[PDB]
Amino acid sequence: NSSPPAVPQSFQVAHLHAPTGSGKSTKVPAAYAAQGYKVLVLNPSVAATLGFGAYMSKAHGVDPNIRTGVRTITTGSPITYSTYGKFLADGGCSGGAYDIIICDECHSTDATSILGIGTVLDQAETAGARLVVLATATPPGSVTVSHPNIEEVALSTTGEIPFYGKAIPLEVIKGGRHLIFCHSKKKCDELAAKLNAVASVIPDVVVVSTDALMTGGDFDSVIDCNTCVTQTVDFSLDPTFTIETTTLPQDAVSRTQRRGRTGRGKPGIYRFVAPGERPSGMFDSSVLCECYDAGCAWYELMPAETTVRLRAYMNTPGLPVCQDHLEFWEGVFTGLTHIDAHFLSQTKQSGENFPYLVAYQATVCARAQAPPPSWDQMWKCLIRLKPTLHGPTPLLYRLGAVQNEVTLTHPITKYIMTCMSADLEV
Amino acid sequence: NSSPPAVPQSFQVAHLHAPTGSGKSTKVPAAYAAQGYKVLVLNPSVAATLGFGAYMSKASPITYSTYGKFLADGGCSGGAYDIIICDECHSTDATSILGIGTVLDQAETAGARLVVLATATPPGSVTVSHPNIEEVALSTTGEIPFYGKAIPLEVIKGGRHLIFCHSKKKCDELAAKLVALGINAVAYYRGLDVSVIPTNGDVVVVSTDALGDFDSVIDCNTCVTQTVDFSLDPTFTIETTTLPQDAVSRTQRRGRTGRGKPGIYRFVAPGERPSGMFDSSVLCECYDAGCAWYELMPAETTVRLRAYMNTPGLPVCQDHLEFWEGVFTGLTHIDAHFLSQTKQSGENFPYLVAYQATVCARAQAPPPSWDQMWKCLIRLKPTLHGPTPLLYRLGAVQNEVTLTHPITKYIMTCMSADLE
Ligand SMILES: O=C(O)Cc1cn(Cc2cccc(Cl)c2)c2ccccc12
Numbered sequence: 001n002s003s004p005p006a007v008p009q010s011f012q013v014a015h016l017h018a019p020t021g022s023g024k025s026t027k028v029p030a031a032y033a034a035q036g037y038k039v040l041v042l043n044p045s046v047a048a049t050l051g052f053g054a055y056m057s058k059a060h061g062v063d064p065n066i067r068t069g070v071r072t073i074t075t076g077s078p079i080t081y082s083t084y085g086k087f088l089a090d091g092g093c094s095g096g097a098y099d100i101i102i103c104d105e106c107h108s109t110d111a112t113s114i115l116g117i118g119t120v121l122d123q124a125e126t127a128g129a130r131l132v133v134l135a136t137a138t139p140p141g142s143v144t145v146s147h148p149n150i151e152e153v154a155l156s157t158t159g160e161i162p163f164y165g166k167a168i169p170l171e172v173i174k175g176g177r178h179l180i181f182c183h184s185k186k187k188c189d190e191l192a193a194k195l196n197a198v199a200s201v202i203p204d205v206v207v208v209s210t211d212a213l214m215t216g217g218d219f220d221s222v223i224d225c226n227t228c229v230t231q232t233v234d235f236s237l238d239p240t241f242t243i244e245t246t247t248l249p250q251d252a253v254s255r256t257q258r259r260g261r262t263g264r265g266k267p268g269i270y271r272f273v274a275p276g277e278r279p280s281g282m283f284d285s286s287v288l289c290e291c292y293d294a295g296c297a298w299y300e301l302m303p304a305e306t307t308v309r310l311r312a313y314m315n316t317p318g319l320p321v322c323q324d325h326l327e328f329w330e331g332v333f334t335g336l337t338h339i340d341a342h343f344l345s346q347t348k349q350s351g352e353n354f355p356y357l358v359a360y361q362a363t364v365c366a367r368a369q370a371p372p373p374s375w376d377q378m379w380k381c382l383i384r385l386k387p388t389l390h391g392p393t394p395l396l397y398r399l400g401a402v403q404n405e406v407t408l409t410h411p412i413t414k415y416i417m418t419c420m421s422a423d424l425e426v
Numbered sequence: 427n428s429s430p431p432a433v434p435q436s437f438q439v440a441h442l443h444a445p446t447g448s449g450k451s452t453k454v455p456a457a458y459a460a461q462g463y464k465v466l467v468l469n470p471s472v473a474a475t476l477g478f479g480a481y482m483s484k485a486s487p488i489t490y491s492t493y494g495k496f497l498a499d500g501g502c503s504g505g506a507y508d509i510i511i512c513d514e515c516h517s518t519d520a521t522s523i524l525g526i527g528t529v530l531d532q533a534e535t536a537g538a539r540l541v542v543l544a545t546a547t548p549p550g551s552v553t554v555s556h557p558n559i560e561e562v563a564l565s566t567t568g569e570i571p572f573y574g575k576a577i578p579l580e581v582i583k584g585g586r587h588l589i590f591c592h593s594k595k596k597c598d599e600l601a602a603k604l605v606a607l608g609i610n611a612v613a614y615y616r617g618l619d620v621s622v623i624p625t626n627g628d629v630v631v632v633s634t635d636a637l638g639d640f641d642s643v644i645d646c647n648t649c650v651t652q653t654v655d656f657s658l659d660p661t662f663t664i665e666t667t668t669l670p671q672d673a674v675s676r677t678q679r680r681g682r683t684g685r686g687k688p689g690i691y692r693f694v695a696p697g698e699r700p701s702g703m704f705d706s707s708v709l710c711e712c713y714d715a716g717c718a719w720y721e722l723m724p725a726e727t728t729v730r731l732r733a734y735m736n737t738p739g740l741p742v743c744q745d746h747l748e749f750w751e752g753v754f755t756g757l758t759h760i761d762a763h764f765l766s767q768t769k770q771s772g773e774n775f776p777y778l779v780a781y782q783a784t785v786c787a788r789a790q791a792p793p794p795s796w797d798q799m800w801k802c803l804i805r806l807k808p809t810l811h812g813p814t815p816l817l818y819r820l821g822a823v824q825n826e827v828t829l830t831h832p833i834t835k836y837i838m839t840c841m842s843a844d845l846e
């Protein structure tokens with residue numbers, strides 16, 4: 001389904017597969033509003049959301065409602081732009097507010113997207129919507145397609161520089177405007193004290209950047225390591241599970257997007273370490289864990305409610321797939337009672353990745369007068385050292401490097417273990 | 427591209443997306459042959475795709491062989507072929523990957539004009555609606571619990587049905603539960619024969635992918651996969667993950683129904699992994715087989731794999747060639763006898779198993795386990811001398827270990843230098 005679908009008389013979920021410049025986020029909502037519908041447009045990015053707002057005011061004199069974590073504008077317009085996260089914060093689908101809900105970038109596999117889309121799919125028909133649109137340029141299974149403005153050239157091993165087992169001739173980046181992607185911060189410019197180039201701000205130049213550079217600077221060529229760092233969960237049974245990082249081949253939305261920084265209307269050249277890519281449409285169980293985490297920490301969802309939402313995400317065709325670990329993660333979080341409220345407040349404030357899990361491990365440490373697994377920033381909420389410095393850490397789960405001695409027999413550790421036996425297969 | 431590539435005038439590598447329902451490369455080889463060219467076609471197997479019929483090598487300007495055979499023969503013979511077709515080139519078993527990489531590295535020097543990488547399933551393929559197969563989601567309503575959903579007894583009492591489970595144990599358990607409910611349920615998996623009644627009254631076969639015709643297929647939509655973990659305990663672990671099935675799996679399992687008459691496909695999950703990735707453990711398998719079967723130095727295996735990975739439109743893996751080449755280079759003075767035994771016995775990593783065993787015998791120390799992987803060492807108490815010099819984890823460890831052996835330290839150092 002590649003053109004905006006017509007509003008049915010009764011509820012339907014439709015997939016819209018179309019390019020980024022198709023104005024999925026602008027033209028499509030506008031045409032719906034123009035037909036008299038009230039439409040919600042959901043995006044993962046705060047910057048995106050605020051940016052569609054601004055584009056619609058400047059370009060078309062439409063002042064949308066704009067709802068975002070940090071900021072809220074209410075104009076009474078029939079178009080609302082919101083982040084998935086802010087949408088979850090707002091209770092999800094709240095009453096007959098929207099005829100149409102567009103889940104933009106429905107290929108996103110960050111936690112807000114999965115839980116948000118899950119929530120839309122579970123609640124929309126009941127809340128009175130007629131149409132849900134799952135919109136993306138890059139549905140599951142997508143591979144990057146050749147670009148008319150972008151000639152692509154394989155790096156050979158022949159060139160003065162060390163680049164991921166291959167090499168670049170400086171001839172190719174001297175001079176002009178050049179973007180180079182590396183996977184980590186370290187190598188991102190321990191590409192180095194190398195040699196006009198650095199890893200905010202720059203107006204002839206080479207930019208050596210991670211993915212942190214958000215899409216939409218001038219560039220004549222892009223050079224691409226073709227790998228990226230991703231979060232994964234390991235069931236390491238030491239005693240329970242571990243949240244860690246892995247380096248993996250990039251996927252199609254990665255490659256397309258990195259390549260897309262060049263050839264922006266004027267011809268550009270793309271240079272890669274590797275010709276291939278993972279096709280898009282998979283994500284890790286740790287993203288599920290994060291969804292439960294956020295539901296407990298931010299959205300006051302019992303684990304069982306979160307499950308209902310994620311189950312709807314998973315029962316819906318055409319979305320990224322993942323290991324079915326809903327039962328397991330639901331069980332884990334359901335067991336984590338009586339979290340220290342003040343600790344949770346800080347970890348949220350902190351912007352730790354799993355504020356509920358960080359605060360809870362801190363909570364059992366504090367009650368046991370035991371110290372955190374390490375003294376990484378993550379555990380700042382326990383600056384109460386001497387009374388707790390005593391003895392092993394009761395390890396629930398590994399969220400980072402563990403420096404202290406540990407014990408493994410706390411009832412909650414054993415509880416998580418029994419959950420692993422209960423809910424994980426083979 | 428959807429149609430056979432013109433034979434170029436200088437050496438080229440081409441891709442061919444055969445149509446989605448297509449069988450093993452038959453039409454396309456016939457065309458090139460008709461134009462006067464000698465064609466080699468390579469598949470994982472030359473058995474009829476149907477599982478019934480003649481071999482593809484039945485008797486000429488068209489030779490049909492396998493990647494396995496091709497590797498065993500030593501690769502591209504002299505100037506024997508103009509055109510080599512690597513068919514089902516989406517296969518990610520060690521033999522297909524090593525074999526294709528070998529073609530890619532050797533074909534031009536061996537006087538071929540054209541290498542064709544053919545598949546009905548390029549990377550990123552998804553399963554498509556089959557016009558003869560109705561697909562119905564399983565709900566949570568039903569007598570028989572099934573991977574978080576339920577199978578109603580009504581859709582399988584009477585008729586013939588196939589149910590895919592991810593593991594032998596699940597197959598045993600499900601069959602038992604069907605039998606107690608009055609259903610004629612038979613379980614199938616590796617190690618069994620044809621207890622599956624091919625007489626042809628009512629039956630519900632519960633099997634893995636080790637597997638007559640069926641009125642319906644019920645799919646758990648998950649599969650068991652071999653993976654490496656760089657676990658640092660002390661080194662790496664070859665283990666199994668249970669993942670969402672991919673498009674070839676979904677297509678192939680669903681395929682068992684609607685083969686003539688209309689069919690029913692029932693599923694636990696609407697989605698699938700996209701096809702086109704394999705694990706670094708396959709790279710490890712490739713070096714293992716290079717050392718164990720094909721008389722390849724690790725560096726010769728590297729050249730073959732590098733050619734594979736430098737080639738677009740093929741499945742992708744982490745680039746761990748330097749790493750794996752590194753660890754096998756360090757694995758010196760393997761005991762010849764043990765390697766024979768692990769090879770005869772069909773272990774997955776004959777070289778690695780026999781090397782860990784070689785290190786035991788020298789240290790005179792026992793195996794990590796006594797699973798039947800470690801057979802070669804039932805010299806079981808000239809030494810029971812405690813601690814096992816653990817190089818890597820190939821399974822579960824039941825003996826106490828020592829992370830002290832120099833080979834252990836060498837691999838660890840390969841890991842820190844070659845990975846990231
Ligand atoms: O900043 C925004 O606009 C989006 C947003 C993110 N969160 C928190 C969060 C973090 C990580 C995962 C999830 Cl599901 C939610 C929120 C929590 C409340 C309101 C909004 C948000």
Ligand SMILES: [Ca+2]
Nearest residue numbers: 234236655657
């Ligand atoms: Ca592990």
Ligand SMILES: [Ca+2]
Nearest residue numbers: 234655656657
């Ligand atoms: Ca790991």
